[PDB]
Design a protein around this ligand. Structure first.
Ligand SMILES: C[C@@H]1C[C@H]2[C@@H]3CCC4=CC(=O)C=C[C@]4(C)[C@@]3(Cl)[C@@H](O)C[C@]2(C)[C@@]1(OC(=O)c1ccco1)C(=O)CCl
Lengths: 246, 11
């Protein structure tokens, strides 16, 4: 009963948006449908995180902080994964009932943010990331953004990261079968993790903007609670993105 | 806040 096999079992099932393309296609409807889907996905992510060996050893405040700080990264990474598997990174596969065409991206209100999200999936395509590699990296993303003032249970947190860095090693081996150039693979995946801060930064920016200036878009309570809590901290520059390479 | 606190404690 390995750690990686447990990560396979606790991985949330792909959710359906219930998007109704019989209705008129508007910007407000799409972003509200995506927000509602996102709220539900975040709920699943909380359940997922609680089932990660080690996560519950952390102080409850640390648990909240990590989820509040990384939720967007987890969602965008998963979206990148789905899009890679479902269409080889050619389409944004938010849900099996909400798949965005190349032609549907050519709309002014969503071209820019779609291009940002496609870049993530194209990294999966470029690196031919395996399922176990993806799962290990996703854990590490949950553990990649912290407060500058630090954490309440730092030592536990440091041991968790250590545990899942090793698991990522196993995922690399399980895929390649013990090469002498596995260090290059590890380097490439840590570089991808690092670049997730930048690739997601512009997504959070547009999200925060939409939430504050209500440019009328609906946010479910799950997202509203995290965003409004997360908002003042980013503006204060109080968040520390952890990076493997300086 | 309250909703995240709930989800972490539940089950
Ligand atoms: C650009 C941001 C990033 C979006 C998330 C990316 C990650 C994500 C993946 C999902 O599968 C479902 C939901 C979210 C969590 C998204 Cl699509 C939505 O909440 C909606 C989010 C926040 C976002 O989405 C868009 O504007 C968007 C998506 C497609 C075209 O525009 C937004 O700011 C709306 Cl308020």
């Amino acid at each position: 009963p390995t750690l990686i096999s447990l990560l396979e079992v606790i991985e949330p099932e792909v959710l359906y948006s219930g998007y109704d393309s019989t209705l008129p296609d508007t910007s407000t409807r799409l972003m509200s449908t995506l927000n509602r889907l996102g709220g539900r996905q975040v709920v699943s992510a909380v359940k997922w995180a609680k089932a990660l060996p080690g996560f519950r050893n952390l102080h409850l405040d640390d648990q909240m902080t990590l989820l509040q700080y990384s939720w967007m990264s987890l969602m965008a990474f998963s979206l990148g994964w789905r899009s890679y598997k479902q269409s080889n990174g050619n389409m944004l596969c938010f849900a099996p009932d909400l798949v965005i065409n190349e032609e549907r991206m050519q709309l002014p209100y969503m071209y820019d943010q779609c291009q940002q999200m496609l870049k993530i999936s194209s990294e999966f395509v470029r690196l031919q990331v395996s399922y176990d590699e993806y799962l290990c990296m996703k854990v590490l993303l949950l553990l990649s953004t912290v407060p500058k003032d630090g954490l309440k249970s730092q030592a536990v947190f440091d041991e968790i990261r250590m545990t899942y860095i090793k698991e990522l090693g196993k995922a690399i081996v399980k895929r390649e079968g013990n090469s002498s150039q596995n260090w290059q693979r590890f380097y490439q995946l840590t570089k991808l993790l690092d670049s997730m801060h930048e690739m997601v930064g512009g997504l959070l920016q547009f999200c925060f903007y939409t939430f504050v200036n209500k440019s009328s878009v609906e946010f479910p309570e799950m997202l509203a609670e995290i965003i409004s809590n997360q908002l003042p901290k980013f503006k204060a520059g109080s968040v520390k993105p952890l990076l493997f390479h300086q | 806040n309250a909703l995240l606190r709930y989800l972490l404690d539940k089950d």
